[PDB]
Amino acid sequence: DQVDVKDCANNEIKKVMVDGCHGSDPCIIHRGKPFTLEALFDANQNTKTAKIEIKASLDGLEIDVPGIDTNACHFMKCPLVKGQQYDAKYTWNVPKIAPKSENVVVTVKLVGDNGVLACAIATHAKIRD
């Protein structure tokens, strides 16, 4: 369902959805299984590129989020047009060995030729079995 996120750019993101999660409820991420999200955002520039930058911290420790194709143009119709609305969807296989945590912070940035396209900080994720 639609979930609560904090915007870390200029509110370009209009809606974020995460399969199995809702609003500001703790969003359970079951390690070893597919995690799917979808976000709608308005492009704030004309750009040939769109690159995903992700940061995740578990109980304060930064960790590397492996296996993500950071070229969003591999899944959106680039070049992106200023003012147009894009539907970004991603399904990521959560590694079975990801450490369980009840205190997760994930920052996902999207960057274009001329700066940040979008940015959201998620603080409700919980990694469990």
From Swiss-Prot:
Give the intrachain disulfide bonds. C8-C119, C21-C27, C73-C78
Q: What is its main location?
A: secreted
The family database entries (Gene3D superfamilies) matched by this protein are listed as: 2.60.40.770
The terms under GO molecular function for this entry are:
sterol binding
| GO CC annotation terms, alphabetical | extracellular region
InterPro entries on file: Ig_E-set, ML_dom, NPC2-like
Could you mention a single GO BP entry for this protein? sterol transport
Domain of life, source organism: Eukaryota
Q: Does the keyword Disulfide bond apply?
A: yes
| Cell compartments where the protein resides | Secreted
**What are the record keywords, sorted?**
Allergen, Disulfide bond, Secreted, Signal
UniProt cross-references to SMART domains, sorted A to Z:
ML
- Hey, which family's this protein in? Belongs to the NPC2 family.
As a miscellaneous remark, the entry gives: The sequence shown here is from clone 2. The N-terminal sequence (AA 1-8) from clone 1 and 11 are not yet known.
Under what name is this protein listed? Mite group 2 allergen Der f 2
At the highest ranks, the source species' classification is:
Eukaryota, Metazoa, Ecdysozoa, Arthropoda, Chelicerata
